[PDB]
Design an enzyme around this catalytic site. Structure first.
Site, PDB file in Angstrom:
ATOM      1  N   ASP A  75       0.868  -1.334  -0.108  1.00  0.00           N
ATOM      2  CA  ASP A  75       0.109   0.060   0.051  1.00  0.00           C
ATOM      3  C   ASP A  75       0.909   1.305   0.171  1.00  0.00           C
ATOM      4  OD1 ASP A  75      -2.076   2.184   0.765  1.00  0.00           O
ATOM      5  OD2 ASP A  75      -3.348   0.483   1.448  1.00  0.00           O
ATOM      6  N   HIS A 103      -9.142  -1.484  -8.439  1.00  0.00           N
ATOM      7  CA  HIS A 103      -9.101  -0.535  -7.478  1.00  0.00           C
ATOM      8  C   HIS A 103      -8.002   0.467  -8.208  1.00  0.00           C
ATOM      9  CE1 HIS A 103      -8.729   2.285  -4.219  1.00  0.00           C
ATOM     10  NE2 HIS A 103      -7.272   1.777  -3.871  1.00  0.00           N
TER      11      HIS A 103
END
Ligand code: HEM
Ligand code: MG
Length: 305
Positions: free
Chosen positions: A145, A218
């Site tokens: 991330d 995403h």
């Protein structure tokens, strides 16, 4: 104009503190805003150079009009609720954000304590999250991330207000959303299915090629180009948090940008979808329980109050 530490080095600990300003608390808040840089130095200096303690202070739209007179940042509005057909981005109260980062939680906690000590009786806490870096920069879904965050000059140009709003140059706009994950549902997917939700390989963090990356992944939905062909970028510093007893496993999302328009375009694509995508598949495992927008002024704006 000197920006706040929006472009922080990588930190492994964070406190997110969101408060509302009680009726009559405006004078106490103004005094604290003019001291926050002093307090950040007092707490952090004795842990330099490895402490990396910084506090980014943000002010919400409603709070701005209570605290200040005259001109406002051009893009400062309350967080825009998104009512998708399936998923909702809620707006929740928040006048002040303190985004406190460091290499250790103890530095974050000490600065939060000093800030909240000065605001006692002037503010009401709305949210407090203690975030931690999870293995090799992974989030609670087990994916790396932050990979495609802009760096260097590219990051400055993406996050800092410039000549488009010259009275507020060196500021930024922060969007926060606390997400909770349905980990039981997520762990029911194969790794290959999870990779189709995110749009990158789980173990090696290589982006899926354009021929297999789904339209509703995403990465696909948060990839946005401007009319002039350039990538519209934000700077994220998402932090895991949770409580094992309560089965609470979360991502604290924070995205900084030059204009809320870039972050809001990404949110619209995630929650309302596009031509080829109903919504971001990440939201089938992620529920937003807060949503707030803040302007993080230039450091010298806060000093001069
Ligand atoms: C719901 C919780 C969220 C999680 C767990 C999450 C996780 C991730 C992961 C794993 C990546 C891929 C690696 C990376 O480049 O960072 C990513 C990329 C990204 N995410 Fe999120 N994200 C979340 C919410 C959001 C939100 C709300 C936004 C925007 C409003 C957003 C914007 C982005 C952007 C711009 C990228 C980079 C896409 C690219 O250019 O390649 N994310 N996120
Ligand atoms: Mg469960």
């Amino acid at each position: 104009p000197e920006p706040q530490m929006v472009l922080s080095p990588l930190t492994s600990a964070a406190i997110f503190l969101v408060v509302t300003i009680d009726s009559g608390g405006e004078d106490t808040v103004r005094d604290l805003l003019s001291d926050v840089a002093s307090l950040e130095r007092a707490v952090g200096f004795r842990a330099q150079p490895d402490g990396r303690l910084s506090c980014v202070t943000g002010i919400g739209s409603e709070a701005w009009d209570r605290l200040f007179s005259g001109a406002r940042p051009a893009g400062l509005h309350p967080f825009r609720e998104l009512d998708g057909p399936v998923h909702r981005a809620v707006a929740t109260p928040g006048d002040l954000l303190f985004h406190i980062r460091a290499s250790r939680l103890d530095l974050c906690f000490a600065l939060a304590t000093e800030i909240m000590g000065r605001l006692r009786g002037a503010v009401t806490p709305q949210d407090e999250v203690h975030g931690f870096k999870y293995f090799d920069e992974r989030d609670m879904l087990g994916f790396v991330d932050g990979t495609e965050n802009p760096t260097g000059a590219a990051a400055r140009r993406a996050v800092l207000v410039g000549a488009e709003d010259p009275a507020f140059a060196g500021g930024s706009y922060a969007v926060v959303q606390k997400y909770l994950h349905d980990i039981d549902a997520w762990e029911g997917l194969s790794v290959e299915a999870q990779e189709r939700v995110i749009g990158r390989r789980k173990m090696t963090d290589v982006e899926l090629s354009d021929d297999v990356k789904p339209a509703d992944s995403h990465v696909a939905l948060t990839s946005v180009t401007g009319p002039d062909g350039s990538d519209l970028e934000i700077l994220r510093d998402n932090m895991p948090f949770g409580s094992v007893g309560r089965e609470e496993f979360g991502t604290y999302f924070i995205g900084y940008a030059r204009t809320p328009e870039v972050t809001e375009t990404m949110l619209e694509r995630m929650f309302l979808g596009t031509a080829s995508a109903p919504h971001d598949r990440i939201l089938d495992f992620s529920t937003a329980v807060t949503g707030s927008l803040f302007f993080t002024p230039a450091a010298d704006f806060l000093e001069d109050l």
